Amino acid sequence: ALTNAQILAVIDSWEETVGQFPVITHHVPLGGGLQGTLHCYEIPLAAPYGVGFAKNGPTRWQYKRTINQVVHRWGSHTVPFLLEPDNINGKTCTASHLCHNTRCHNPLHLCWESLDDNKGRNWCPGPNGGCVHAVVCLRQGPLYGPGATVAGPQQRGSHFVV
Amino acid sequence: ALTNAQILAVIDSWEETVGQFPVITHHVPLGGGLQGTLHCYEIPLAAPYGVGFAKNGPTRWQYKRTINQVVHRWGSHTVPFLLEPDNINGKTCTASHLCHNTRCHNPLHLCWESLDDNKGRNWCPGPNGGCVHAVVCLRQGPLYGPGATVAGPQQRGSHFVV
DNA sequence: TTGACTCTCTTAAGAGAGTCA
DNA sequence: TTGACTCTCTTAAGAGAGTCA
Ligand SMILES: [Mg+2]
Ligand SMILES: [Mg+2]
Ligand SMILES: [Zn+2]
Ligand SMILES: [Zn+2]
Ligand SMILES: [Zn+2]
Ligand SMILES: [Zn+2]
Predict the structure, then answer these.
(1) Closest Cα partner for B151 from A9, A39, A10, A95?
(2) Fewest CB within 10 angstroms: A93, A155, B64, B137, which?
(3) Nucleotides of D under 7 A from a protein CB
(4) So what does this one do (chains A, B)?
């Protein structure tokens, strides 16, 4: 809600509830031929999810609290960042999964950044493969690699140069 | 329907027309602190665009030819790839700008790949900065870099470990 | 046959809000 | 007040199809 105290209280309640989610170990590529271990705090697959949580989409959830008799609701991964600016360079800030695991609500696996920065982590080589993200990646992005291009640049005639 | 010879004739007429688009020289980052040059063949900003071309969206165009009284229409960047497979790994193939310049229709600046591969080139370090795309990038992706993350992973209590 | 407009849709990373019990 | 559902929207890389003269 409006007060910093009320916001800190929302963050504290969220952390307490998510801290009781099942902790699932995931071994992950780091880049550079190395592997690491992440501990994700995963929201349940079906109701009940936890106090204050409800599912609004196949992999979308919301957290809600009643403050001053009014319901306040947020995207379930945005709560850690309620005291941060909600935009940057005129772009909306988004909750970004460093573990690339949507059900995870571990705030040690989340950052707050533009949707472009968020998306781009999918292709990052990872913290041991050359990640240059100032807020460093926790793993190599799941889509990093050579790709599967069907056809490359080509011309039939002689009208074009690179 | 259309024979492979009719398709080649469409590609040839498309190349003839695109080859007469204004050619703009762009200096671009290659990665590794190096600079290179790309020559983009840019569709005009407003009508007329060129024989067979029409705008269906702010940065979307289509190419149209009528053959034996039947109207055929294609996305304006898909024409170079009409003799190629149109899917791979269960994913639709898309025209992917190696020059990251949507108005460009230079077929030497295009490849044909999944939408995920396509998007990922936005963050590639480039052909002189560590690109691992099998069909190599022509330049560093426009969104490559440290990013502008507003807040990193953090917790208020001690409920979480990474 | 052609040009110049019109409309809505896909994907996968993210969102806000209403209806009931 | 709290839970469990419902719906559509945003973005930026990409698409298909209709109308009129
Ligand atoms: Mg993400
Ligand atoms: Mg692209
Ligand atoms: Zn996680
Ligand atoms: Zn990274
Ligand atoms: Zn180009
Ligand atoms: Zn590349």
Answers:
(1) A95
(2) B64
(3) 1-18
(4) Mediates the homing of a group I intron in the ribosomal DNA. Makes a four-base staggered cut in its ribosomal DNA target sequence.
